[PDB]
Design a binder for these strands. Structure first.
Length: 49
DNA sequence: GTACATGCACAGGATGTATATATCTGACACGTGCCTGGAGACTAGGGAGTAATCCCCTTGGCGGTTAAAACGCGGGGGACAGCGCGTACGTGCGTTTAAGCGGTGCTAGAGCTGTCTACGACCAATTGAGCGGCC
């Protein structure tokens, strides 16, 4: 059921492994990359199909 | 040397009490579990010490005037009788709370949920001191 999950890149995401997500949206971008790259891959990982 | 307050006894009713009885508070023996005595390891502030040096309390001389002690001037505080407004007994009547056994509420506990301030901590911007160039 739960359509959408709300996160922060520097706390909500950290290694949290949301394989049930199909898609990712950045409503914000950080002054450093890597945090966004991790934020994507906390969905984009080997547990998806 | 004095006689009013103390000191001993009578009169007598109540209060200190014994026998007789039923029972709930306290004693006892059990264990849970709360937590305190001991004791360990380390932190790093509190304390003690050496030390410098500054300034208050006591001290001694002195001058002032107030209380003490004495005295004069004179009345209100300690003591007897009447007036009359309260204070202490005793009863009827019953207002009042007792003491009871359930019905229900709200008060208490431990914990949760929600702060939510308020505190370090990390994270990313952006800024001043560091060293070098130029005419």
């Amino acid at each position: 059921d739960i359509f959408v999950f709300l996160l922060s890149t520097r706390a909500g995401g950290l290694g949290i492994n949301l394989t049930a997500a199909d898609t990712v949206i950045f409503y914000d971008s950080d002054w450093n990359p890597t945090v966004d790259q991790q934020a994507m891959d906390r969905a984009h990982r080997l547990g998806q199909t």
